[PDB]
Amino acid sequence: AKQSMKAREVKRVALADKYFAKRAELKAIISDVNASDEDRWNAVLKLQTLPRDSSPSRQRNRCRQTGRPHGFLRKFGLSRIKVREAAMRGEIPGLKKASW
């Protein structure tokens, strides 16, 4: 991936980190069946006001080395291609070719 994309991702992450407490609270408020209608409405509107990049469902998991969006693995934080390389080199602990 590009540098720019990576930067964007980072920014998104930062935003998420920032706005988590508020956003979560808002969500809770919206959910809470034992609450006022007006309040709920306000909460809904409030959420809209907050930045979009603040959402965690905005950020894509990219490879930590290359930034490749596809072929990702969570345990390693790496795209398949890089993961394989790591494995070959001995750089991922415990990981070896499996047969059964």
Partner 1 sequence: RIRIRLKAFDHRLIDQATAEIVETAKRTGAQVRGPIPLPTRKERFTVLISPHVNKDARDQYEIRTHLRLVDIVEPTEKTVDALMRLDLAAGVDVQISLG
Rg of the chain over Cα atoms, rounded to whole angstroms, equals: 20
Site membership for partner 1, residue 93 (CB under 8 A): yes
- 5: which residues sit within 8 A by CB, 6+ positions away? 62, 67
Question: Using CB under 8 A, which of the segments 4-12, 14-22, 26-34, 77-85 binds partner 1?
Answer: 77-85
C-alpha–C-alpha distance, residues 40 and 46, integer Å: 10
Site membership for partner 1, residue 90 (CB under 8 A): no
**In the complex with partner 1, which residue's Cβ is closer, 21 or 100?**
100
Site membership for partner 1, residue 75 (CB under 8 A): yes
Alpha carbon separation from 36 to 13, 18, 32, 41, 44 (Å, rounded): 33, 28, 9, 9, 12
**In the complex with partner 1, which residue's Cβ is closer, 22 or 70?**
70
Residues that bind partner 1 (CB under 8 A): 71, 73, 75, 80-81, 83-84, 87, 93-99
